[PDB]
Write the structure tokens for this entry.
Amino acid sequence: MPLILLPAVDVVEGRAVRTEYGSAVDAALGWQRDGAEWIHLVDLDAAFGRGSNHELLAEVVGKLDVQVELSGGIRDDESLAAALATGCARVNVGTAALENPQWCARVIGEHGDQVAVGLDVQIIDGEHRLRGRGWETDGGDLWDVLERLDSEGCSRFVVTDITKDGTLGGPNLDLLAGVADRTDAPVIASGGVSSLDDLRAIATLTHRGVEGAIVGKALYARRFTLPQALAAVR
Ligand SMILES: O=C(O)c1ccccc1NC[C@@H](O)[C@H](O)[C@H](O)COP(=O)(O)O
Ligand SMILES: [Cl-]
Ligand code: NA
Ligand code: NA
Ligand code: NA
């Protein structure tokens, strides 16, 4: 199977942020039109705990035909309830959720494939720590947590290097490899794609566990179009 591409629509104040703003419905519909397998839909306000865009996010999901991965501040019963209640295929439980490790284990049993766990990674003196984007504190060691979630039956991981996210500086192929080598759960890469060559680079890891790649900035920078990226990975 070819690498999956998930175009990213990040919502702030009820508009898609790309610094330019515009309709989030339209952005997602346009990506689906260009032939998106999935949309990665993000409530940035909810991720930073600063606001909420559920009602708008529920609209976006209801209007699309394609698979939607929902993400942003998904951290507890209420936040997980509203996310699943949009009818999205998948929700992305944020790194910040790891503050309550048993909540994570409990919701993994309850929801199974509907749940992915976000791993936002920062190398600190060589060490792979977890530090949620939008979160104020450290969330533990990557490998200790990846192992724990793998034995708890985690169905998929979303792996970000917080230092490459939105930077167009290339992905962290060491991190993508390291994670995937350590688990049979599908891995979705997020952050730092600059080119079609990066996609192709990510695609080489499909075989050891990287099924997909989320792309935001390189699409809005017009570095490549979606059908181009779809071609290159096939
Ligand atoms: O996706 C999330 O859950 C999240 C949470 C807090 C802060 C940022 C977040 N993600 C924004 C995200 O959708 C980025 O656009 C993707 O990681 C794409 O990376 P980019 O291609 O822009 O380098
Ligand atoms: Cl989340
Ligand atoms: Na992540
Ligand atoms: Na970054
Ligand atoms: Na990317």
